Point group: none
Chain length 139, copies 2
């Protein structure tokens, strides 16, 4: 039981970000970012693009580091600890539509306006936003 | 026995705090705070968040130490002595509703306005309020 590194991606499209309802023992049915586990030797940017491609089929570019959060899930069925590196990115083709490529992990992916985010947000994401974090402006 | 450390949590939501009627040999049916026993190696703030999650499902943040009380129950069915650390917190999601996740310990959780608190309050809580303690301003 060690902390594991994940990368989560804020895909920015106009005033919207991509979110999807989790299928998971942690935060089931709450809206969360696409993302994945960092693999050995992988850069944050390579992981962001790979996880996004694997989950959504979307092709992203201009990956930029935003922040890092410490997320402990002691009450989970298997207790877990993730260190989540957040990456900002945009679409290579702004008309490309998302697909639900890994339905075992997500109900489906859609775009949500910054000022009309859906509920319930997965609590690490809600808590990050509650700090004042803004993926469009953070720098 | 020895005195046991408990953490009790004032979840502030607007002008309200979360209370529920106890199911317990001590103070049965009186209104009390969510809380739990402090575990070895745990911080007060970690205990507060864990106990609130386990009893109410609520996710809390901004945990802050308020005070500590000495609560001896010599007349209890099993005599007991708790040292209760009070923590203030707020909801991560202000619209999240509580659930009765441990009905063996509580009849259910609801929000109560500071100026319209229910009766009967659990005596340790009433005693603390009677001192002038205010969780919003302390």
């Amino acid at each position: 039981a060690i902390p594991r590194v994940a990368v989560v991606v804020f895909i920015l499209n106009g005033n919207s970000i991509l979110l999807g309802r989790r299928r998971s023992s942690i935060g089931n049915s709450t809206f969360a970012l696409p993302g994945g586990h960092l693999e050995f030797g992988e850069s944050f940017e390579e992981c962001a693009a790979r996880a996004v491609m694997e989950e959504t089929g979307l092709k992203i570019e201009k990956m930029k580091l935003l922040t890092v959060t410490n997320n402990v899930f002691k009450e989970a069925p298997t207790p877990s600890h993730y260190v989540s590196v957040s990456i900002r990115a945009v679409l290579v083709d702004p008309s490309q539509e998302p697909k639900n490529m890994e339905p075992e992990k997500c109900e489906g992916w859609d775009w949500y306006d910054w000022e009309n985010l859906p509920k319930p947000l997965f609590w690490p994401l809600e808590k990050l936003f509650g700090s004042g974090f803004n993926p469009f402006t953070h720098g």
